[PDB]
Design a protein around this nucleic acid. Structure first.
Ligand SMILES: [Mg+2]
Ligand SMILES: [Mg+2]
Ligand SMILES: [Mg+2]
Ligand SMILES: [Mg+2]
Ligand SMILES: [Mg+2]
Ligand SMILES: [Mg+2]
Ligand SMILES: [Mg+2]
Ligand SMILES: [Mg+2]
Ligand SMILES: [Mg+2]
Ligand SMILES: [Mg+2]
Ligand SMILES: [Mg+2]
Ligand SMILES: [Mg+2]
Ligand SMILES: [Mg+2]
Ligand SMILES: [Mg+2]
Ligand SMILES: [Mg+2]
Ligand SMILES: [Mg+2]
Ligand SMILES: [Mg+2]
Ligand SMILES: [Mg+2]
Ligand SMILES: [Mg+2]
Ligand SMILES: [Mg+2]
Ligand SMILES: [Mg+2]
Ligand SMILES: [Mg+2]
Ligand SMILES: [Mg+2]
Ligand SMILES: [Mg+2]
Ligand SMILES: [Mg+2]
Ligand SMILES: [Mg+2]
Ligand SMILES: [Mg+2]
Ligand SMILES: [Mg+2]
Ligand SMILES: [Mg+2]
Ligand SMILES: [Mg+2]
Ligand SMILES: [Mg+2]
Ligand SMILES: [Mg+2]
Ligand SMILES: [Zn+2]
Lengths: 122, 122, 53, 206, 113
RNA sequence: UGGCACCUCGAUGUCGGCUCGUCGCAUCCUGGGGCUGUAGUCGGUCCCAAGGGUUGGGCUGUUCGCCCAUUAAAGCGGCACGCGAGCUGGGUUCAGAACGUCGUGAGACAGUUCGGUCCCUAUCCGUCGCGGGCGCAGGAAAUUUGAGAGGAGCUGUCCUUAGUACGAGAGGACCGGGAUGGACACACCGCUGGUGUACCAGUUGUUCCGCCAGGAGCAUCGCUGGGUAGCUAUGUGUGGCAGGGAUAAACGCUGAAAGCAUCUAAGCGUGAAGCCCCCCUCAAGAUGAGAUUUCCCAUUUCUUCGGAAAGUAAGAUCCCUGAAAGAUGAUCAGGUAGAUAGGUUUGGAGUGGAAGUGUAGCGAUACAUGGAGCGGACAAAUACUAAUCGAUCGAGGACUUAACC
C-alpha cells in the first residue's frame, strides 16, 4: 500500500538512493499501489556522481512491499522493506544491477529485464 | 456474561463476596439479575470441592474470602470458609451432577422497586 | 427549543392516552386461597409449589 | 429452473483440481416436500409451494395440520414459493433432493441479513466524519438537511435508524460440491444471514 | 467447532505432513508452477506462527535473504507442497515468535535441542 | 457592475472552508446523427440527448488565479451569492500596542502589522425508524398477486481482425470477438490483519493470606508478549450481463395534391448511455381495504323491535427460561407432549510446559513425572436446577337482485 508522500528505498545501481512518491497511475481516483505497479516519483537523495541527479522527476516500479501480494494458491509473501526500481518509458531499468530479492509478481507484468538481473525471485 | 452496573475491578470483588455468603449462610437475599450471576460461580466452586486435590484447593482458595464461619471447641479452633466448602458442602453433593442452587422469586423492594429473590443451596 | 404556542386541553389529554399502567398478573393460591402473583413465592402462607420454602 | 430451501451451516474452504483454494458455504437441505401447485385457472399465476423442516406436533396447530394432510406429510416449519418454474414435474408430495443441481451450476441465494440495532449515519449510510481536532465539534453527525427556501426537509434525507434485517439476494454465485448422502450443498462465496438462517436457492435468472 | 464441516473436509486433510512447532527450521519443497512448467523451489527458514484449526491451519516461515527479511505463509494441507522437512528443532518460550521481525543476526539465534 | 428605496432597526448573523445534497441545460466525458478546407489517424461546427460520471497536491484568509502530477472528463449556473437553534473562526467589524502619512491638538486612514468570550433541555409541521387502536358485514393459521413507489444506470487499457481498407510516403482505422482494471454498491468472517477490561503467560514496588512454598489487593486493564466468541476493512464473494416495445435528431420505401418530382398529406421501415420494460427492494389503510389452501361451527338468558350479555370452539395472550433479535414495545427459539437458559461429562480454539515430589548444582536456575495445567462468549450428549400452578380474551355470521340449486 503505497500512496502520495510515501518514501521507499531504491534497489538498483542508478544514482538515486531515496524516492518520494508523487502520484499513482491507473485511474482517476486511485489512491494505493502495490507490487508490480508503476508510480511517478521524485528523488530526495542521491549518491555523488550518479546518473540520476537529486531533484529529478522519474517513473518507477515497486518490487517489494511491507505488505506483499497473495497468490491464487492461497499462499502469501511479505518483505521487511519497501523498495523501488527506476525504469525508462519502456520496461527497461535505468540502472545496471538490481539488489535484494524480488517478488515473482513482476514476472507476470513483462518486467523480464528486472527479473533476470535480480539475485533471486521469490 | 453480564455487567452489574460497576467496573471490572468492583464486579470481581462483588462476585467473591456473594459467593462466600451463600457458602457460609446457605440462604441469602439478592436482586434477580444479581442472583443469576453467582449461580454460575458457586456451582463451579462446588466442583472444585468434589475433586479434593491440593491443586483444586489452591485454585478455589484464590476466590473464597477469609473469614471464620464459626468457632469449634475442639482448645479453640476457628473454622474458615474454605474448610466448610471442602469438608461439609462438597460431600453433600457427591451424587448430584449439576444444579446445587435454586432461585425463588419474592417481589419488589420498597425503596427502588428492585425484584428480590431467594437463592438457596440445595 | 422553546414552545411556540401553548398546548390545549384536547392535545394535552390525547397525548396521555398511553400514559396508563397495566393490571398486575395476579392469581389464586390453592392452599391459602388468596390472591398471588404467578411464578412467585406466596408471601403470607409462605410457600411455593406446596413446599413451604 | 429449479429451487430448494436450506439452512446456513457455516463457512470453510476447499482445494480445487487445479490446485487453487476457494471459500465455500455449507447448506443443509433435508426434508423438502412439494405441498401445493398453483395454476392460472385457480390463482392466475404459476408457482410451487415447498416445505423445508418438520416440527413436533405440539408446535403445529389445527389449521396447518389439514393443509399438509393433503400431501400426506408431517407439519413443516418453513414454507415458500417458487415462480417461473416448470410444472410438468413436481407431483404433490414428492421429495425434492439436492441432486437436482450439479457441478458448476449458477444459482441465486436469497436470505435475511444479520441484524444491527439503532445505527448512526456513518455506519448505516457510509457518510463522512467531520474533523476530529482543530477545535471542531462536528464528529459523527448527519449534515445539513437542505436549503432554506422549501421551508421543509425533502424525502430521502438519510438519517439514523434500525440497520439490518432486510431481504437481500446475491446473483451469479457458483456451486462447488454437491452431496446426496449428507444432503449438503457447497456454494462458493457468501450468503446473507447468520448461522442456522433460512437460505432459498434458485437457478440464476440471468 | 462444527461437526458437519468436519466430515465434508475430512478427505482433503494431507496425512504426510510431519509434526513441527513454531521455532524450528524447516525446508519447504514448494512447487512453483508457471504457465506450462512445474519446478520445485526450496524455501528454508524458521517457523514463526501456526494458527487455525482443521484444513484452515496455516504456518509462516521466515528467511533472511540478501540482507532483506522475507516471510512466507502456506496452508498446512495444500497439495502444492511436494514434501516438508524439519532440519533442526529449536527451543523457544513463545507460541508466536513476532519478536524476530526487528532483530538482526547474532541476536536472532535460536538454540537447539 | 448599477438605478429605486417597496418588507425587516421591540435584531432577517455577514466572507471562505467542512458535512449533506437537490434542480436547470445555454453539454466537460460517455450515446445517436447532418456538414466539412471529411483520403487514413487526429479534428472543427451544428442538431437530439440531463442516465451516470466529473482528481490529488505547492503559494495565499482567500472566491479566483498561477504552478507540479494525473484523468474518458477535470462543465456553467439556481436553491437568503443553498446549508453557523449542523461545525470552524483564518478574514471582515469593539476595547491594547506599533509603523508610514494627515492634523497645532484630542485623533484619523476600506493603508499595514501582533493579540483578541460564537448562548439555547425541540412545543407544532417536516425527515428517519419502531409500536398501540379500529377498520376491511362470522371468528382464525399460513402462502401470495400487484396498482403505486424507491435503488441501480459510470468507464479505461491490452490482444486479434491487421500493418488489412486508405495513402506515394510518413503514417494508419470503423464495424466484431477476447482478456483484465479504476471508482462505486450489497453481503460475509473461511483466508490476511484490527479490537477483544470475567482467556493464558512474564515482570517491578508495596500491603495482605501467621511463616517457606503457593496466591490475592492497588498502582491507566500497573506494565509487557499473545488471543476465543462477537463487531470489523485495508480482506473475500458478487453486481451494473445479454436483451424487448415505442420514440428524438436523422436516413429511407410507396405515393398524390400538381399526369413529372418530393420521406408526408393517408400508410409503412430502420433509428440514442435517453422513455416504458428486463434486474433488486417496499408495497391491500390500494377505506377501490384483493386472491388461494386449511380449521371451528350454528349454544344459553332476555327481548315489543332494532338487538342486548355470557359461558365457549378453532386460535391467541398474560406469566416464566432466553437469543440468531433488540433503546422500550415488537421479532424469533421454548414452557415437563421439554434440550430454552444455567450446571455436569466429553471435546475445540488460545496460551504455552501447572501445583506437589524427585534429580544436578554452594547459589540464581535447569531437567523429569507431562503438548502438562488452565481454558468468557464455540460444539455434542445429559432433566441435575429454573420454565410449577392458573387466568384472560376470542363466532353463531344484515338486506336486495341474478344464476344455479
Ligand atoms: Mg493497504
Ligand atoms: Mg485496577
Ligand atoms: Mg415470507
Ligand atoms: Mg470533539
Ligand atoms: Mg494452536
Ligand atoms: Mg420580534
Ligand atoms: Mg439542448
Ligand atoms: Mg458524438
Ligand atoms: Mg461530427
Ligand atoms: Mg447527464
Ligand atoms: Mg511545505
Ligand atoms: Mg443574489
Ligand atoms: Mg450564502
Ligand atoms: Mg440555519
Ligand atoms: Mg486603540
Ligand atoms: Mg506633525
Ligand atoms: Mg496569545
Ligand atoms: Mg440539541
Ligand atoms: Mg398496525
Ligand atoms: Mg476475520
Ligand atoms: Mg513467600
Ligand atoms: Mg488495598
Ligand atoms: Mg494486554
Ligand atoms: Mg446493458
Ligand atoms: Mg425498434
Ligand atoms: Mg384479505
Ligand atoms: Mg447459544
Ligand atoms: Mg409461545
Ligand atoms: Mg444446556
Ligand atoms: Mg516444570
Ligand atoms: Mg542440590
Ligand atoms: Mg418445579
Ligand atoms: Zn398461599
Amino acid at each position: 500500500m503505497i500512496q502520495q508522500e510515501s518514501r521507499m528505498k531504491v534497489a538498483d545501481n542508478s544514482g538515486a538512493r531515496e524516492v518520494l512518491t508523487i502520484k499513482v497511475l491507473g485511474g482517476s481516483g486511485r489512491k494505493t499501489a502495490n507490487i508490480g505497479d508503476v508510480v511517478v516519483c521524485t528523488v530526495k537523495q542521491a549518491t555523488p556522481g550518479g546518473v540520476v541527479k537529486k531533484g529529478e522527476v522519474v517513473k518507477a516500479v515497486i518490487v517489494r512491499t511491507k505488505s506483499g501480494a497473495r497468490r491464487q494458491d492461497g499462499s502469501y509473501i511479505k518483505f521487511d522493506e519497501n523498495a523501488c526500481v527506476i525504469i525508462r518509458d519502456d520496461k527497461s531499468p535505468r540502472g545496471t544491477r538490481i539488489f535484494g530479492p524480488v517478488a515473482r509478481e513482476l514476472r507476470e507484468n513483462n518486467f523480464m529485464k528486472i527479473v533476470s538481473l535480480a539475485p533471486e525471485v521469490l | 456474561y453480564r455487567k452489574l452496573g460497576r467496573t471490572s475491578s468492583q464486579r470481581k470483588a462483588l462476585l467473591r463476596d456473594l459467593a462466600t455468603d451463600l457458602i457460609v449462610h446457605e440462604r441469602i437475599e439478592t436482586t434477580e439479575a444479581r442472583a443469576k450471576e453467582i449461580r454460575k460461580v458457586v456451582e463451579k466452586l462446588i466442583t472444585s470441592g468434589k475433586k479434593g486435590d491440593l491443586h483444586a484447593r489452591r485454585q478455589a482458595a484464590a476466590f473464597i474470602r477469609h473469614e471464620v464461619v464459626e468457632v469449634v471447641q475442639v482448645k479453640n479452633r476457628p473454622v474458615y470458609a474454605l474448610q466448610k466448602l471442602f469438608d461439609d458442602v462438597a460431600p453433600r453433593y457427591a451424587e448430584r451432577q449439576g444444579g446445587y442452587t435454586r432461585i425463588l422469586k419474592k417481589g419488589p423492594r420498597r425503596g427502588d422497586g428492585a425484584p428480590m429473590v431467594i437463592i438457596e443451596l440445595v | 427549543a422553546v414552545p411556540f404556542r401553548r398546548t390545549s386541553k384536547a392535545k394535552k389529554r390525547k397525548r396521555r392516552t398511553h400514559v396508563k399502567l397495566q393490571l398486575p398478573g395476579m392469581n389464586e393460591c390453592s392452599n391459602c386461597g388468596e390472591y398471588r402473583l404467578s411464578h412467585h413465592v406466596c408471601p403470607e402462607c409462605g410457600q411455593y409449589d406446596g413446599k413451604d420454602v | 429452473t429449479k429451487g430448494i430451501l436450506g439452512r446456513k451451516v457455516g463457512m470453510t474452504q476447499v482445494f480445487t483440481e487445479n490446485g487453487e483454494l476457494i471459500p465455500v458455504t455449507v447448506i443443509e437441505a433435508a426434508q423438502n416436500v412439494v405441498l401445493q401447485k398453483k395454476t392460472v385457472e385457480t390463482d392466475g399465476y404459476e408457482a410451487v409451494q415447498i416445505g423445508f423442516e418438520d416440527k413436533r406436533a405440539k408446535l403445529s396447530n389445527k389449521p396447518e395440520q389439514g393443509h399438509v394432510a393433503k400431501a400426506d406429510t408431517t407439519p413443516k416449519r418453513f414454507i415458500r414459493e417458487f415462480r417461473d418454474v416448470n410444472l410438468d414435474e413436481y407431483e404433490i408430495g414428492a421429495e425434492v433432493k439436492v441432486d437436482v443441481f450439479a457441478e458448476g451450476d449458477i444459482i441465486d441465494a436469497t436470505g435475511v441479513s444479520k441484524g444491527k440495532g439503532f445505527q448512526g449515519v456513518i455506519k448505516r449510510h457510509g457518510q463522512s466524519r467531520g474533523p476530529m481536532a482543530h477545535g471542531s465539534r462536528y464528529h459523527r453527525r448527519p449534515g445539513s438537511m437542505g436549503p432554506v427556501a422549501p421551508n421543509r426537509v425533502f424525502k430521502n434525507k438519510l438519517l439514523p435508524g434500525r440497520m439490518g434485517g432486510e431481504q437481500i439476494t446475491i446473483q451469479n454465485l457458483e456451486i462447488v460440491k454437491v452431496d446426496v448422502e449428507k444432503n449438503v450443498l457447497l456454494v462458493k462465496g457468501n450468503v446473507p444471514g447468520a448461522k442456522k438462517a433460512l437460505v432459498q436457492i434458485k437457478t440464476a435468472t440471468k | 467447532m462444527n461437526k458437519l464441516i468436519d466430515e465434508i473436509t475430512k478427505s482433503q486433510l494431507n496425512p504426510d505432513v510431519p509434526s513441527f512447532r513454531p521455532g524450528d527450521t524447516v525446508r519447504v519443497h514448494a512447487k512453483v508452477v508457471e504457465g506450462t512448467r512445474e519446478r520445485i523451489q526450496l524455501f528454508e527458514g524458521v517457523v514463526i506462527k501456526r494458527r487455525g484449526a482443521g484444513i484452515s491451519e496455516t504456518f509462516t516461515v521466515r528467511k533472511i535473504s540478501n540482507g532483506v527479511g522475507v516471510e512466507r505463509t502456506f496452508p498446512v494441507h495444500t497439495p502444492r507442497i511436494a514434501k516438508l522437512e524439519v532440519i533442526r528443532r529449536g527451543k523457544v518460550r513463545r507460541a508466536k515468535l513476532y519478536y524476530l521481525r526487528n532483530l538482526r543476526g547474532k541476536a536472532a539465534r535460536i538454540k537447539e535441542i
